[PDB]
Amino acid sequence: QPVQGMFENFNIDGLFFPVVSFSAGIKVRFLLGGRHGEFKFLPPPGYAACYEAVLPKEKLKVEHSREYKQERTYTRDLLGPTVSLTQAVPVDTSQIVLPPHLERIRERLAENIHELWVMNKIELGWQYGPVRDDNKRQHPCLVEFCKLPEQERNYNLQMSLETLKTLLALGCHVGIAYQLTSGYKPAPMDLSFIKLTPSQEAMVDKLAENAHNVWARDRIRQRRNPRLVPYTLLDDRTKKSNKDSLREAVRTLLGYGYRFRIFRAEKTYAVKAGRWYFEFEAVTAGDMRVGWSRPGCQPDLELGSDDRAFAFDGFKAQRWHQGNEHYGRSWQAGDVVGCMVDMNEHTMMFTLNGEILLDDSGSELAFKDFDVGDGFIPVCSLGVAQVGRMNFGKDVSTLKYFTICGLQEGYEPFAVNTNRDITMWLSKRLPQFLQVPSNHEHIEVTRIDKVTQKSFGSQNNNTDIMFYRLSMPIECAXXXXXXXXXXXXXXXXXXXXXXXXXXXXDSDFEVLMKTAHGHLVPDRIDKDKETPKPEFNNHKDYAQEKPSRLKQXXXXXXXXXXXXX
C-alpha cells in the first residue's frame, strides 16, 4: 500500500541513486530483479529497476556513500578529488557545401557501396526478387545503378555524401590524386590487396562511430535496446563489422586516384627536536606532494607555497617552498618515499625507494637553516584521482626502507612510541561559514555607531562573489511563517512564506567590484527590518534569509528545493 506523501518540485540536477542509512543492529536486503534478487511485489507500469539501470558491460558493486568509511588499519587508500566520470551527439557533416568537382566520385562510391550491398547478400545466398524480404533470401535492390530508381539509390548516395563530408569535417583534403549472380555482376576491381594506413584505419573507425551515433539517436525513440549506448561504449565483437562497412569508402577513394586534498596529523603531535622519519606510498604517479608543515598550514592553499610548509612533488621532481626548485627525480606507479627531518641540524631529506634524492648542487640535503617555530607535522597533498597511503611508524615489520636508511643515523619513526593511532586530520570539502578575520586581504568590514551600520570595503585586482551572512539567526514559532522583501518602493518579490519551525539567517551574496560599499543596516518601520543598502553596479547581488547551507558556486538559481505532500 503506497504512502500518502512525496517530495514533488525537487531539483533534478545530479545523478540520483538509491541509499540506505543505518546506525547499528540491522540486517537489510536490497531487492532487485534477476540474479541479484527477487521482487516481493510487482512494480508499477513503467518503473524499471537498478539491475537494468546498470550500464552494459560494467559491474555493479556497493560502496558506502562517498569515501573510505572502512574499519581498516593505516593501510587505507586515501583519495583526493575526482572527475565527473568524463561522461556526465554525432559529428556535424551536413553544414559543408558538397563540391561538385567530386560529385562523380561521390556517385562512383555510392555505386560501389550499392554493389557491395549486393555482394554480401549474394554471399549469403540472396537472388533478385520482386518482394522485399529477408528470409526469402532475395532483394529487389540488386539491379544496375542506372535502373535503380530514386527510392532505392538515395541510401548509397547519402552514404557517400556523409562519408566525404565527415572526411572534410575531420580535416583531410579530398580531391585529385566468381560467384555467378542472378543478373548483376558486381566486380569493380581488386580493392582488398594494398595495405590501408593506420590513419585511414582510424578514419574508417570514426566513420563507423558517426554512423552508429546517428543510428542510436534515431533508435532512442524506442524497448531500451542494449545498443542504445554510443559506439565507444559498445562491445568489441561487432565493432569490426561497422568498421569494414566504412573501410571500403576510403578504399575506393585511394584506389580511384582521389581542488587538491590536504592531509596531516594532529597539531599537538608537532615535534621540536630529534630525528623523525615517515613513509608515504603512492600507487599512482600523478599530482602528489609530501613533506613537513607547521601547525598553521592552510587547508586550501598549495602545500609549500608559503612559509608554513616544506614539501616535495614527484610529478615534477621539485622541492616545494616559496617557489619551486628542481630536486630529485620523479616516481612511478607503486612507489614509496621516506621523508626524514632532523631538528638538531635543521635538515630535511627524502629517499625514493631507499635511494636518497640529489639536488642540482650535488647535496643530498633538501632544506636547511629553517626555524623550529612551534613544530613540524607531516603533511601530504593529493590531486585529482590520486590515491596514496601514509605510514607514521609503529609498524617496523611493515616499514620497508627503514633499515636501508634511518636505522643507523639515529632516525626515529614518527609514531613509534605510541599506544594508539594518529587522528589523521584532513581538508574538508563543505565550506562552512567563518567570521571575517582582521588579517584578511581584499575583504575588510567596519562597524560604526541615527542608526547602526556595518560597512564593507575591499582593495583587490581580481573579482569574485561572496556569501556574507549574519551571526545570530531569527527563529520562527509554530504560528508565524512569512517573509516579505520590500524594495525602495513596495513589497514585490517571490512568495517565501513557509516555515513551521525553522531558523533563518540573514545574508547577502554580493559581487566584488573595485569599490564595494554595500552594507547591512538594522532599521525599523513597523517590525524586524534589515536593509541591505547597495550602491552602483547592483544587478547580480542578492539579499535574503537562509538556513544552514554549504555550497560555493556562482549561480542565481538552480538552488535545492522540495515540496512535501
Added chain:
Amino acid sequence: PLSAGLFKSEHKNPVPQCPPRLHVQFLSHVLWSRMPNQFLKVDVSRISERQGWLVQCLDPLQFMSLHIPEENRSV
C-alpha cells in the same frame, strides 16, 4: 519591531542597536576535519545471493557532539 530585538533576551526595547555578537560571517574554505579512529565496520555478504543483496551491522558505536545554538551546528 527590530531584528536585534528578536534573537536576543530583551524584546520591549525598540531602539535598533547591535551587540558585539552580530558580526558578518563569510562562506570560507579554511577548515579542517577529523577522521575518526573508529568506524561502523559494515560487512557485506559478498555472495550476492539470488534472494537479495545483504548488508549487516551489529557492533554499536556512539560519540558525543557539542551543539552551538546560535550557529545551529553540531561539532
